[PDB]
Design a binder for this molecule. Structure first.
Ligand SMILES: NC(=O)c1ccc[n+]([C@@H]2O[C@H](COP(=O)([O-])OP(=O)(O)OC[C@H]3O[C@@H](n4cnc5c(N)ncnc54)[C@H](O)[C@@H]3O)[C@@H](O)[C@H]2O)c1
Ligand SMILES: NC(=O)c1ccc[n+]([C@@H]2O[C@H](COP(=O)([O-])OP(=O)(O)OC[C@H]3O[C@@H](n4cnc5c(N)ncnc54)[C@H](O)[C@@H]3O)[C@@H](O)[C@H]2O)c1
Ligand code: NA
Ligand code: NA
Lengths: 344, 344
């Protein structure tokens, strides 16, 4: 037995061969079915993630996220949020890896990049929620925060809504000015616009910022369109929020993971008895979403490990088809199972 | 930037090149200093490990154990306890891996086997505690459970005490028969002995069994020598214990990790108010342990992630000196930090 390692090269070859659109659609479809299975009680939400706060060079966090499929495998994603990474080191803010362990023996069976996978399934989750809660003729997307997640927010949403334009804002002028080039492949025209204009004109918004704890909101409490749907995607430290309390109190709020969202999502700001049914329930029974497209809605997204397990399965299916990756004997399996020093 | 991976073959070469005694001594020395640093408030106990119980084929657990050295690195050990592994699959009961992440950026910098490392630092921790709490002229070691951990329990304790004899028991006759061959490199004469004889004769005992929840004790509450020191090393599921309650209530008890031990150690049997100073405090101030060498003592061992980080450092230092391991690009670092699709 050896660990199946998908290097950065193998992950790149999967998305190159399959195509960004098709790969994103596969992950959207997988997440949709998987969320519906949770909503039907056929599967369970992942346990709460844990994390270690880091103060330097700026406040960030490093988190671990398990999800068990009993009798089959356990998925663990380890992921850092380090928002000085881009400017200071030319590294992504979100850096992670995803591992799979055999549930029967405990053995490490597969290991892969989590950077691309994280951006894909986070876009896909917003797409699942926005298909339920945004107007199906939504034309104008607003983006607050135009870093890494903004790219897959725009991409995923462009596959499920007829988006024609994106109004975008970032507090870093370089990061907002570069977004059009990163977005170009989608065919959605990009225009820089201040947050008040985005609030007034957008049919759907995604907020995905590295705003510090206590420095929200990133979208002002002002007039929005009656049917606005917001994907609140930023999430890292306890205390970090993006939306104004007044807007949230007027909204139909569905969390991907209620207990996690109450700790780390916009639901930090809300009384627990004001949550709408969670996303998995909407996927299994759309009665709870019926009519909510035409009034203010918020998808409170924190991400949870089941989404990583599902996206990992999409990657492993493609990689297995193509015989991609390498085998590394990482774990020591002594010839005598009772002898740690039998270094066979 | 690529991840440094030490495979099974590199770990085996470290042992072959450094030597078992020298490698174990390095890990004992690192653990003693690190624990003293915790006892002096220069470093801090790792957070509580987390875990997922599994019921098939027999009850076991899969656990994650993070530890952070601020500004340097984060260590995470992922480890399964699957006690049917030896008989059913020829695999060790304890199967795990240790990963190292840069604390500044979050990047995965190193990954190695945790099977051998786990056995080494678990023996080392018992040796640290027993040097403090066992009579320095202890001649007879008792072992209940003669699986993988027993091998390094005997090895490490033979390096810090003048052991002449090991009295050993396992409920599996083949496992107790084979222990002497697995122990031969230590030079300590092994005898098979039933638990009541071990309790009556031993100067120091380690219990390290796969006993099931609620099926203890593995050592009877009968005559023990006045000065007996016990390393309670078995630890997996909540509810699993190895010592008789009456013995525990008479003993001076020190945990490696009080909060973990209250959940998963012998201290499950004890009121929270009943524990002594933890092992770290005894390392920093051994005056609190010297006076307990001649009375009944228990080191309640659960294992915690700091031990894995320290032992991993020993292996990385030795592997670097010998240019061992491979470099694998696992994480995706896009050429544009804000573009997840910018596959370099
Ligand atoms: N919900 C999920 O599942 C999920 C998954 C991954 C990441 N995230 C979170 O999404 C957030 C963004 O991640 P990323 O990978 O895009 O990081 P990033 O660093 O690539 O982009 C964040 C951007 O937000 C901008 N920003 C900071 N403060 C702002 C403000 N007040 N207004 C507007 N823009 C602002 C920054 O200048 C930067 O360009 C983080 O909180 C991250 O932890 C969530
Ligand atoms: N404290 C720590 O840091 C730490 C580290 C690693 C493992 N552990 C724990 O130590 C225990 C042993 O692990 P291992 O790797 O040696 O497993 P192993 O399966 O190699 O050995 C366990 C042995 O215990 C024997 N056994 C079971 N029930 C018994 C009983 N009632 N009396 C006597 N013997 C019995 C089994 O026959 C087996 O030979 C496990 O609970 C493991 O989770 C603790
Ligand atoms: Na959120
Ligand atoms: Na214990």
């Amino acid at each position: 037995m050896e660990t199946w390692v998908l290097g950065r090269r193998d992950v790149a070859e999967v998305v190159a061969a399959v195509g960004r659109d098709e790969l994103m659609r596969r992950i959207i479809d997988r997440l949709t079915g998987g969320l519906a299975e949770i909503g039907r009680g056929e599967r369970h939400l992942s346990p709460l993630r844990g994390g270690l706060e880091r103060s330097e060079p700026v406040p960030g966090i490093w988190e671990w996220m398990p999800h068990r499929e009993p009798g089959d495998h356990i998925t663990l994603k380890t992921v850092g949020y380090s928002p000085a990474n881009p400017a200071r080191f030319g590294l992504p803010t979100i850096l992670g890896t995803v591992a799979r362990y055999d549930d029967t023996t405990g053995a490490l069976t597969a290991l892969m990049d989590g950077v691309l996978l994280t951006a894909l399934r986070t876009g896909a989750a917003s797409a699942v929620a926005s298909r339920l809660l945004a107007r199906p003729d939504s034309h104008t997307l607003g983006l607050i925060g135009t870093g890494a997640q903004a790219v897959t927010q725009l991409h995923a949403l462009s596959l499920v809504l007829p988006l024609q334009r994106a109004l975008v804002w970032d507090t870093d002028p370089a990061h907002r000015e570069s977004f059009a080039r990163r977005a170009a492949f989608t065919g959605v025209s990009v225009e820089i616009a201040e947050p008040a204009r985005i609030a007034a004109e957008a049919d759907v918004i995604s907020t995905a910022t590295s705003v510090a704890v206590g420095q929200g909101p990133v979208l002002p409490d002002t007039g929005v369109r009656e049917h606005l749907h917001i994907n609140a995607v930023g999430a890292d430290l306890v205390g970090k929020t993006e939306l104004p309390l007044g807007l949230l109190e007027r909204a139909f709020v569905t969390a991907d993971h209620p207990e996690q969202a109450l700790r780390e999502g916009e639901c930090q700001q809300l009384s627990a008895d004001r949550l709408g049914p969670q996303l998995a329930h909407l996927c299994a029974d759309p009665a709870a979403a019926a009519g909510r497209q035409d009034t203010l809605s918020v998808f409170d997204s924190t991400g949870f490990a089941f989404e990583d397990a599902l996206a990992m399965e999409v990657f492993l299916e493609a990689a297995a088809e193509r015989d991609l990756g390498i085998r590394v004997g990482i774990e020591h399996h002594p010839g005598d199972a009772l002898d740690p020093y039998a270094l066979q």
